[model samples]
Structure formats: C-alpha cells, structure tokens
Target: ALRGTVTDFSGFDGRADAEVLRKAMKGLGTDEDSILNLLTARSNAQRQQIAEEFKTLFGRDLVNDMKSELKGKFEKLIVALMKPSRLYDAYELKHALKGAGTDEKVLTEIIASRTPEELRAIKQAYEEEYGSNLEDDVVGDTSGYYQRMLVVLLQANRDPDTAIDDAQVELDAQALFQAGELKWGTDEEKFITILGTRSVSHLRRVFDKYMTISGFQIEETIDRETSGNLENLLLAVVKSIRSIPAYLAETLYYAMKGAGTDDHTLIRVIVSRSEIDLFNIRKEFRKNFATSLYSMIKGDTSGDYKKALLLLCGGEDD
Candidate 1:
C-alpha cells in the first residue's frame, strides 16, 4: 500500500490548537515544545484550519508570529510545514531559480519527480505568487538541452493512457537505444523527449526492453552517455518512474550522509514528503540502508529541530 507518516490526527480540534498556539507564543518564554508537538501531529489541511482559527482568535498571522519567535533551522522547518504544498513548492522553485547560483539539485528533484498535475499546480502557484510565467523563468535561468527538457515537462502533457501498445513500447526502446548505447554520440533530445513524455507504465516497459537491447540498465546507459545537469535530471526521472519512494529514499540518504548535512534538502524532502510517501520512504530507507531514518535523524540532528523531525518521522522503523 502507498504510505505516509503524518495521517490525520483523530482527536483534532482546530480551535483548541489555535488557542494553545496563541498561549504558547504569548508568554515571556515561547513554549517551543507545545508548538512543535501540536503542529507536527496535525495534517497540513488541519494546520490550514488552525492557521485560520489562530487568525480569527488573535487577529494575527500564525506563521508570521512563529517567524518572530522561532530561530534557525527550527523556524525554517516549522515555517515550511505551515505552507500549502503547492505554494511551498513554488516558493522553493523561486528560491532555487532567483539566487546568484542555481540550485540545480532542487530544480532536478522538483521537476523530475512531480506528476503532470502537480507540475501544473506548481506552475500556476509560481505565476500567482511571482507575477511571472514559470516556463519563462525556467528558460531564462537554464539553457540548451536542459532547458528544452524542462520546457517539455512544464507543458504537463505526458500521455496518460493506461493501455500500452507492445509495438510502440518496442519502438520506443529501440529509439532510445539508437539515441544512446547504439550511437557514437548521444542524441540528447531523443532521450529527453522519450523519457520526459512517456507515461510511467510505458516507460517501465521501455526500460525492460532497453535492458535487452543495451545489455545495461537504463541508468548505466544514461551515465555513460550524458553529463552535468542534464544527466542528473534524466537519471532522477528514471528512478522516480521506477519507484518514487525509492528515489526519495536515496535523496534522503545523500542529504544526511556526508561531512555535513544538506539541511535545506533534508528539510525540504522530510517536510514535503512527510504527508506524501514518507512511510514508504522510511520503509525503503531501512531496506536500503539497513538502519532506520529515525535513528539517522537522531544521530545527525540535535535539540528542538531534531525533536520536531523525529515527531514527523512518526517512529523508528528498525
């Protein structure tokens, strides 16, 4: 079954939560624990209600008040949790594209993983918030083959037909083989067009046939054929098409594994996916790493931030 860690809190009371939050931040010392404990337990829909109730009771913005009181990563994480998913993604995309240096990883993860419907929502959210077209911004910030693929994805027109034609799948597989493994130099556009536009079920079958033709995994073929942001983006799409949860599990692993944590990625992946596929991500995390994501968080983080993440994580799977 598809899984998520943050289910609806059964004994939920939006008004009570708003009032409790009001008290927690009103006094001399902010009750960080109470705020964390309450917010992390509620689903995002419930949190939206809490925000509205909070504004009605206090006549103030819950998110703005939290920003004033909370500090560092804790504030960042909580604030992120407060946003509607579509808006949060738009905000992240804006941040990634607007800055001096492009955060290609974020761009790759977001564009490559989102479903066609989700990409459309995020595109609309970006335009509404920024007064600029998402496609224009993506094109402005990126160039060449990468920009082409991103544009194709932004169309949000991947064929959604469930019935797959065996001949079409075979031809698609052969086309990809001709583009990469069978050719001296890769036809990058062919790779992008096929991979970016095909349905997930169609691609999965294409990948199966591809292995027979290339004598290598599609990932290996991509690795040998391409380089840079284009390579990474294509690889992400393949992995996500294979299993989104498994791809996300790998994303989380890398975010926490190195000399220092990728807290931005850590926060984004954990907070965004908590209500999506985190339970499955957790299952994949343990299966792949032979350790629980909970323990990894416990080891990698400290203080209230860690506690909030632990609570969102639900429990230790191992």
Candidate 2:
C-alpha cells in the first residue's frame, strides 16, 4: 500500500522479455517502439533479471546493446531503468563524489531517504562497482558532523525497532535541546546519533515531545547549530522521518526550479521513484506548487529525454 504508485509491471517473463529486447536491438535500425515496450513496463527486479538472462542466452550485454543503439536522454533514462536499484544508486553516489562542485544535495537526498536495508545494499553495490569501501570515500571527502552522520548512515546502524520507550523519548528530547538551543557550543554527535539511530515513529514522538520541552522545533535547532551540507542532511533526516514521498516531491521541485533544469536530478527522481510512490509524488508536486511536474518536464526538457520522462510520469504534458 505504501508503494501504491509504482509504475512497474510485476508479472515477469525474463527469458521471453530478454529475447524480445534482443530482437528489438538486433536490427539495422533500433526498434524504438519495441524497446520502450520491454524496458518501460518491467519492474527494476524484472529488468535486472532480463539483462542477466540476456548475457547468458545471447552472450551480449543488454545495456551495452541499448547504449550502442539508443541516444541522448532516451538512452540515459532507459539505462537507469535497467540497473538494479542499488547499482543505479551506486553510480549516482559515485557521480556526486567524482566531480568538482560535488552535488551534496544529491548525496544528502539519497542517504537521508534510504532505509537501513536499502542503504546497506547501496554500500555493497558501491564496493562491488568501485573496488573500495563507501565509508572510506565518505570519511575522506566530507568533514565535521556531515562526515560523521554519513558514516553512521553507511553503517546501517539505525535501530529499526519501533517499540516505543517514552523515558528515552524524554531523555532524547532534552539531549537534543541541550545539545543545541540551550548550549553555546552544539553537541553535534548528539544530534547525529539520535537522528541516525532512532526509529521514525519514535522520532515523530520525539519531535512532538521536543517542542513542548524545549520551546523550539528540532528543525530550527538544526539550522541554528549546523550550516551548509550538514544542515541540509540533518533537515532531510527530519523531513524524511515525516514523509519520504513529500520530501522527494520537494527535492524534485528544487531540482527543477533553479537556474536551468537539473536533468540528472530530474531523471533520478522519476526513474527511482517510478517503482515507489511516484503517483503520490506527482500529486504532492501539484498540491505543493499548484503546477504539474509534467508541465515542468514539457517546458524545461526537449527531444527524447522529455518524451521518455513523460512516459514514466504516465501522462502527456498538457
């Protein structure tokens, strides 16, 4: 029920689908119609299986075949669709870390939003793809509380037990308040530990109790205590605790609005969430901005990318 909006067809026929995909790409001219049918309709799990079977059955990489045939935004979107979610995210994580002016927002958005299980998979994928541990990069690249928090997240150390401890809630509330609003120097690890280790249901209770005890919102304290990427990461944890779909909708809105379009962010949001709560995200986007994300796509992007994006979004741009 939570992922009610995922745009995936779960009824899988991996070998048959792989054969159809191979035939589509085996021709002189790539069959765009045939390609879209197989690629767009399958779930991420199905596509991963399709590619695996393609290698065994046909001895060619399905992704490489598509890369050689497809071009531009179409190819980019399609390739992302084919990846196992963790592997796709490994590249996103690597890309954020690889270049100058690192995309910290992308890093924070991903790390903050993913579950412990999902994050562990990404870490494993990171090592598998890059031949190094993810924590080494995070520890080396970032500094201060931001670095520490990222490491904690990578540890997959969050306590998943939602069983409530009210005394712990009161203790955490004051620990949080004394850590920031009541102190001259903020205790950053306190914030990092409580946020990173606590359960969402419990945190919601903590935040609720925090306000009555501190006369300050935890979000305001984070803003006051931290600055830059650390601030964003902490806030993302708070917001994600509240609602991931809504947080992602806001993330996509920011990615779409500024300077020029952030096509990379746009594609990531659409492709990753397509199999999650995308329909709810689209609804949230419309409610939040009073404009369609579809319209944003129509206006900001062009050519095959625009076409492929709208296809995942499940409507014509109007």
Candidate 3:
C-alpha cells in the first residue's frame, strides 16, 4: 500500500534559493512528462515537499507551472499528482462539464467509479469549497434518469473501513432482525447508520453471519421488507457492500445503454473513486462486464470530459 505523512514546509528557507530550483527545472527542460512520471509516482507527502522545494528555489508554484506546460490528458495527470482535495478535483470536473458544451465523459468516469467513502469525502469537500452540495450541482447540471441515479448515489453515503464481529452471529442475526425483520418499524436509521458507516470487509463478515443465522441473503430480506426508493437504496448499499466494483459496473452499464448518459453519476464515481479503489474497480469491471473500463468510456463519451476521465483511469498514460 502507498503511504506518506504530511509535513509543514513553511519553515524551509528555500525562498532565498529560488534560482536553484529554477535551474533544476531549466536543466530538465520542458520534459514535463519525465518530471511528472517521476514526481507523481511519489507519495503525497513527497510531492508536497517537491512543491515546497520547487517554490522555495524557483519562486513559482510547481502545480501552476505544470498546468502551463501540459495540456489534455498529460496536464490532467500531472495536476492530479498534486493531490489537491478530492473535493477540489470534483469541483474542477463539475465546472468543466456544467456549461452548454458538457463533458459527459468526465462526468461518467467520475460518477461510475468512485467508492462510497471517497464520494462522501468529495461531497464534504465540495460543500466546504463551493458552499453548496455536490449532489445539488449534479442535480442542477443533469436531468432525467441520470439525475435520479446520481442523486441516489450521493444519498447512499456509505462509509469505508467498517469492522465486523464475525464471532457474534447471534448479535448479527438480532441486528438484522431489528433492522429488517423483527418489526421495530424497520430500524431504518440503524440500518442506514451501520450501512453508511461500516467498511466493506466488516460488512462482508456481518453479511456472512447474518446469512448463517437468518438462512437468507440480506438483499432478499431488504426487498421483502422495505418499500420505495428506500428499498432500492438499501439494496444498492447491500450490493456495494458485497462488491463495490460489480455494483459500479452495473451502474455504468445502466448509464451508458440509455438514450443519454447519466453524466453526473458517471463523473462523480470516476473522479472520486479513482484514487481509492479505481484500480480494483477496473479489475472488477472487466471481470464482471467482460470489457475494459477505458473501452467503455471511449464508446460512451467524447472530448474534454473523456480526456479527464481517461486521465483519472490512467488510460491517457497507457
């Protein structure tokens, strides 16, 4: 797993040596591809240090310089390397596609591929940055089934890294009963709290225990008990718990097959999830759908949005 810790670089007195950093880049010339490949491959903390050092020595923003030097897929990739808030990334993407000339490809890629936890973070960040909900922006920018789907995803709000008490089969059974079958009026809040808060691994164990006790799958129980979009939402949560990638692929399948792309949902998932579970999602997408994610994006989207999506997917690099 990749790992790095954050450090404050303000203390560094490298501002006096800006010329040195400039000289370093000057010596490297305009081969941003090489610099990006080398630097972006490092951990976020490492990149932050590079940014600080570059600024101190060259008196210029490494990120801004890169943005100026690169364009299209290459530019997006290097920018992603800066590790800005995922929310910022989402905002940038939303702005890119919101106008009349929408970038459906970016929208699709981000929405279809993000993990629920990452989505939550992005949502939080977007709200902080834009003073409005990301989901609201999505709703306003897109329409029809696409909006419905994106709204549902934004509302799901599933958590990452849930822990399971595998040994507590009876407890799991009881929780399931209380939440679904035993008639506490569907403990919907409890269900949402747990489902929205737990990690997939923990949920898997809980699911296994639940099945062992109830002798039925959670999805079937939810379908039998719940009503309306709540039922569908519960089902999506369950599916996500079982297999996020497969669930995402299913969402993508639905998004692209229709008259218009569910661009909002599409972009939200891809942009938010790429850093988290995208590689795994890509693997799962091919395994479940028998087609590459890139191929699907290529078939479904076009232009700048496509460029952004492909960059997030590492398709541009390939």
Candidate 4:
C-alpha cells in the first residue's frame, strides 16, 4: 500500500525516462507543491537519492530548477525543504543582498534562523568561498544595532562547555566584586571580560555558584555596583545567558516600539536570533505580546525586508 502510494505520487518509474520528465515539466510550472511535498516528506537519505534522480533524469539541478519556478514565501519554503549545504543558503543570501541593493529579508531570515554552530559553519564557508569575511559584508550592508549584533555574531566566540569548579567560581566572584560590588562600585572591565569571554554553559555554572556563595543573583550585584551603559551591557549579557529567547524578545520589543524605530536593531535581532532560539523566541513573543511574531514584523516593517522576515518566521514548526 505504501509503495503504491509512493509510486502514484512521485511517478518514479514513469520519470525514470528523461523524456517523460521533460514533457511533464514543460510549461506546467514544475508542480512545485508536489515536488516539495514529495521531497520534504522523505527522510534525508531518501531526499538525497531523489535529488540525484531528478538531476540525472532532468539534466538539471533540482534546487536551481525550483528557484526558477518559484518565488516569495513559496520559494523560501521549498528551498528550505531542500536542506542544501548550509553554505549554499549562506551564499544565496549574500548574493541576494550584496552590492547596490539590499534584500533585508534574506539577511534577516538567514541570520535569525541559524544555530550558533550552524552560524559558525556558514561563516567559515562564506569566508572560504568568497575570500571575504562575513563581518565585513555585514558592516558594509548594515548599521547601528543591526550592525552591532552582526559584529558580535561574526566574532563567534559563544564558548563551548567548560568544566566548573567551586574555586573557579570564588575567583570569578572575587573579580566581579572588585570590579563591580565590593569596591567603589563595579568594575566594567571585569564584567565585560567575564560576560564576553565565557560560554553560556560556563556562565550558567558560574552564576549558579555566585548565587550559592554570595547569596544574591548577578543582576543584584550589578544593580548595587554598576551604572549607565555598563549596567545595561552587564544585564543584557546576564539575560542572554539565562534565557536567550526572552533576551531576543526584549531586543525585538525595543527595536519595534518607541518614538523612533531602531531599524538596525530591528533588522539585526530578527535576522540573528531567527536560527538560534527562534522557535523558543516565537513562543516567548506570542506569550508576552499575545500576538504572533509574524504579525509583529508585519506591523513594524515593509517591502522586501519585511517580506523576507515574514517568510523566515513563517512555517517554523514549534
């Protein structure tokens, strides 16, 4: 029954003959929905085999063929379904937004939807292939908060897991106290160094230890010791470490609301956070705002930029 269903849908045996596929695809608009449904439903191994088959029989790259045949959100969905090399997606976005014109949607979606590990990989691929750093392109293309966020991403030092020890926590706490609380109020350099240098996992451990030993949260320590931009930066790092999704939601909220929209922050947050905690971020957004993330972007942005963001945020499975 399953085999019958598969054959019925894919027309596998019939498509084995290149002429038949050519005839089928001719002026038929390529049956994108059928192709996507068929390919995405398959296991990764199965999809790979099907991709090879499509190439051999059609004398075309399935991904490229789809690109020509589709547009907008439909195209994004279909291409995402293909799950091509991460580099391919990175490269595609770069080309879409590079030089003389900007595709904010492509930039935002790619940045928002990739995991840190995936982002790292994309950076490596982008640099290796283009002979230019991703950060350089980002700086040229964007500014303000968006630029700042992208710069941080390009730095890509989000730390791997580190072993924790009580002694280490005490030493860190001593540093924090000297820099922030115990002395003449806060050490900005010490706070920045720890927050910037430590991995999320390590930071979490350190915070846990700090709470146990100091009888207070890091936020409290900062509140007592720091002021101004230093305080804000310390708090931002702390929030991000504690709950990335919430941190992102706050960023988006600030970007979209207020007297003048911070376009750079708006764009950067949407793009950069999309891949990492987007699923969680979406939930947090809806929970906090009582509206969908898609709706929020729609209300705040316009044109190609808005469209790209909407597409990236859309159809993301929880």
Candidate 5:
C-alpha cells in the first residue's frame, strides 16, 4: 500500500553501488549529493547487500562508516536505509529503551502493532542487536499494572487461531466492563488477559459487545482509567486491532503536528510502511486530518531530510 515510486533498484551491481558508496564516505567531507543519489534510489534489499559487499571490499562496516561520515537527519536516513527493516525496528526499540527512561510510545508501537511472528522475530533481533532480553528490559524499566500489560504482550502470546465465539466474546466483554468502568479501582489483570490472549477478530467482537453493555468503547474505558504509557499501550492494541493503517496514520499525524516534528516517528512510519501500507496511511491521513501526508511533510520539513521523506512518500496520491 505504499504507493511509493522507488520500487526498482537503479542498476544490478551491489558491489558497484558499494564501491561508489564507499568513495563518498572516504573523502574528508562526505558527498551529500552522491550519498543521497546512491542510497535513496535503491530498495532496502539492494542497499543491505551493498553494505555486506562494502564490508568485504573496504574492510569496514557500511552502517558504521555512514554514521561516522554523515551527520544529522541525512545520516539518519542513510543508516536507516542500510539496516534490514526488521533489525532496524529491533534497533529502534533498543534505542528507545536504552536511555535514562524508556521511550514508551515507540516501544509500545513496536510491540503492539507487530504480529506474533513479527514479534518473535523482533525479540530474537533485539537480543542479537542489543545483547539483552527485551522482556527483561521492559520489566526493569516499567512498573505496576503497565509493566504487567507490556510483559503479557512481549510473550507474543495472542491466540491467532481463534474463531469468533459469540458467547466467549460476550463474556470477555463483561469481564472487561467489570474490570475497568464499573469498579472503584481498576483491575488491569482482566484487561491484560482478554487483550493479550484473544485473536484480533475476537477482540473486535469483544469491543462491540463491551460498548453495548457499558455505553462506552473499551478505548474510552482505558482513557477514563489509565494514563501515560499504559493508556498508549492499550490504545495501541485497540487501534492496531481496529485498523493498522488508520492507527499508524494517527501516529504519523501526531508525530508531525504541534511544535517540532517527531522525526523518529516520521522516519519509522514512512520507512517501515513504505513497502507495506503507506498508501492506506496516506488515505487515513487525509480523512482524519483534512490534509495530505505529502503536504504535511512538505510544510513541516525542508532540505535533504524533506527530500528523503518525500521520495519515500511518493508523489501526492501516487
């Protein structure tokens, strides 16, 4: 759904692209024009091979070289393009968790939106990339009910084979209602179990049933009962279940709006979804915000960073 324009690699030689990329990194001052030309035009698959070949030929790592040679946003684009998307996401999650406090928004998005298979791959990738357990870091960094919810998700435990059981959905919906809205104090454990254990299809039915009983959507109940990362985490689950593109579009809009742009989010969404569903995200953006994703990026950013983003975003409505 990307509607992205850069589907084809510029040419056939990984070693040749690697050669030119190396030369750009070799000079005292990095060649911005050549770097952009060489990296931005290829699919990530090609770029990754170039990196491997670069390592072999130059006796150096491409990502390491790019990091040292380039600076600022341009550098971020280069390094992002260099990593395989999955490992890149793993590294991003690692970056989010490495600081004094967790970047819970980023961590939640990574955990909540990923499929069970993707989640398992990410957990493996995280350990390979960062030398620590993803669950261990999440456990160490967060506390209380929030930690419990996140930990449940990190298990990649959501049941994928579930067929809709109307009786089970209704019962789960009631459990959700009693646990949050009707209670004097929220029982997050029940919320955790149902959300963590159900299939996406089952959860959607449960959401509808919960609304019929409580006169409020489960999301509204989460809003009323929770705050901070906990709220975001639950909402991420709900949103991803309801619609991944719409949820991602909302995230992208927020990331670009109010004060300065959240460049990390902008990069993550566009690059991550470029080969998957950026087109649907674009549609959701226009529907939700009354603005096109292209113009939003255009208005909020400039120069090569903007160019990189625009290139990945594709032509307006393309």
Candidate 6:
C-alpha cells in the first residue's frame, strides 16, 4: 500500500492530546520531546482536530502557543504540519513572492508541481489569506515568457484527460522539434502552450516522440533553447511529469547536500508530502541517492529538529 509515514494515529483522542500538549507547554522549559513525539505521530487531520480541541478546552490557540514555545527548524516543521495542506502552500507561495529577487526555486517547485485542483485551491487560499489575487501578485513580481508560463499554470486548466491520442502526440512532438531545434530563434509561445496545456500522459508520449524527431531529449532542447526561469519551469514540468516523487527526491537531496542546508526546502518538501507520497518519496530517495533519507537526516541535522524529521521519515529505507 502507498501509505505515508504519518498515518491517522490509532485510538486517537483529540481532547486528550490537546490536554497533553497543554501540560507539556505549561511547565517551565517546555517538554520539547513530548510535544514532538505527540505531534509527529499524528496525521495532519488529527493535528487539526487536536488544535480545535485545544481551542475549545483550553481557550488558547495551540498553534500560537507552540509557536511561542518552540524555536528554529523544529518549530518550523511542527507549525508546517499543523496547517491544512493548501493553506501551507499558499503561505509558501506568498513568502516566495514577498521578498526581493523572488524565491523562484520555491515558486517553481510549488507552482509547477501541484495538481490543477490543488492549484485552484491554493489560488483561493492566497486571496483569502492575503486579500490579493495570486495571479496579480505573480504578474507583479515575474516577467516575460516565464511569467506567461506561470500565468498558464496558475490558471489551473491543463487538460486532465488520461486518454492519450497517438496522432496528437506525434503532431505535438514534431511541433516542439520545429519550434526549438529546427529554427534559428525559438517559438516561445509554442513551447509554452504545448508543454503547459498537454495532459501528462500525452506529454510523456510527446517526449518519447520528441527524442526521435530532434535527436535530443525534450529536456535537452529546452535547456539549449530557453534560459532563466522559463528553463527551470519547463524542466520542472517535464521532471514532475516523469515522476513527482523522483523530482522531489532530487529536490530533497540538493537541499541537504551542500554548504550547510536549505532548511526551508527540507521543511517544505517533507511537510508537504508527508501525508501524500512520502512513502514513495523515501523509496525514490533510497533508489536514487544510495543512502537512506533517515541516515541523511541523521547526519545533517541535530536535536529536536532532527528528532522530529526522523520521526516523519517514518523509518529507515536501507
């Protein structure tokens, strides 16, 4: 079964869990271990339930209380777990867009990776949370063909048909080849429309045919023809279509590999996928990275932060 690490905690009692959390945080020096142990074991829905019970019984917000008590990466991971998935992504998107230069890595990873339904909800969440249109903010911050592709993705209108048309695939593959490799200047919109609108199944066939036509992989053509954000966005689409778990495994590996750590990406990917496909992600990590996700976390992080992450990791893959 494709189950995640954080399952619905069996025999779960929201009120009791809330009480336990209250007691843990009530005393001096906060029982960090107790809090992490309890929260990490429960599913996101369970956490939300515990949160409501905390509010009802204690007359205090559990999230806010936890926020005040915990610090650093450990705190970040716990707070991320507490959010409903879409709201969490909405906040991340807002954070990515808020500052200078724009966190395009965050933007690309989230925007290019989410499903159409997820994107629609994230749009609603963005407006609801910030009182501004997500599309408007994206336009304000990004530009050119990259912005255009982002606009297309943000529309959440990609064809969802799983039924692939062989003829259409052949035609689309050639169109891509003609647009990029066969021409002196690239047809930006052509690549944008075809890549952004096609069904994932259809895209896979197109990529296969594309290699036959251009004597190069779809990724290679995009890399040769495109630059900057557009290249990253296009590659994300291709890789995610190939396999999202694999794409995220690569994302996770890079986050922890060099020069300390990209704590944000590590937190974002793990928390976001924990309940969705972390089981598969962990599998992909073992397959691709050789070492287990558990060992990587063991080596790269420390203290309660490491403890919470290891718990979320579920178990060792090696």
With candidate 4 superimposed using the best TM-score fit, by how many Å does residue 167's alpha carbon deviate from the native?
4.7
**lDDT head-to-head 3 vs 5, winner:** 5
Q: How accurate is candidate 2 locally (lDDT)?
A: 0.83
| Tens-place lDDT digits, model 2, residues 1-318 | 555234556567889998898888885988877787667777788788889999999899888999999987778888888777768887888888875656777789899998888898999999989998878887777887888888888888888776899999999998898888889988888899999989888999999899999777888888888888889999999989888888888888898788788778888988888877888788777888888888878878877667667777764321
Q: Each candidate's lDDT (Cα)?
A: 0.91, 0.83, 0.61, 0.61, 0.83, 0.91
Worst 10-residue lDDT window for candidate 3 reads 1-10
Give the per-residue lDDT of model 6 (tens digit) for 1-318. Answer: 555777898999999999999999996889999999999999898999999999999899999999999999999989998998769999999999997879989999998888899899999999999999999999999999999999999999999877888999999998988899999989999998998988888998999999988789999999999989899999998998888888988899999999798899999999988988888888888999998989998899999999999999857763
For every candidate in turn, the CA RMSD to the true structure comes to 1.3, 2.9, 8.5, 8.4, 2.2, 1.4
Question: Which ranges in model 1 have alpha carbons more than 4 Å from their true place?
Answer: none
Kindly report which residue pairs in candidate 1 clash with one another. none
List TM-scores for all candidates, in order.
Answer: 0.96, 0.87, 0.52, 0.53, 0.91, 0.96
What is the per-residue lDDT of model 4 for residues 181-228, given as tens digits with 9 covering 90 to 100?
567744565676676666677778788777876788989987777654
lDDT of 5 by residue, 248-318 (tens): 88999899887899888888878877767777888888888888898899989877778878877855742
Q: Name the candidate, 1 or 3, with the larger lDDT value.
A: 1
Q: Of 3 and 5, which scores higher on TM-score?
A: 5
The TM-score between candidate 1 and the true structure equals 0.96
Off by over 4 Å in 2: 4-33, 52-59, 99-101, 315-318
lDDT per residue for candidate 3 within 152-186, as digits (tens), equals: 55664544554445555456556876678778566
> Per-residue lDDT for 1-318 in model 1, tens only?
877889888999999999999999997979999999999999999999999999998899999999999999999999999998769888999999997788889988988888899999998999999999988988889988888888998898998969999999999999999989889998998998899899999999999999988798999999999999899989998999999989988998999998788889999988888888899999888999999999999999888999999999856764
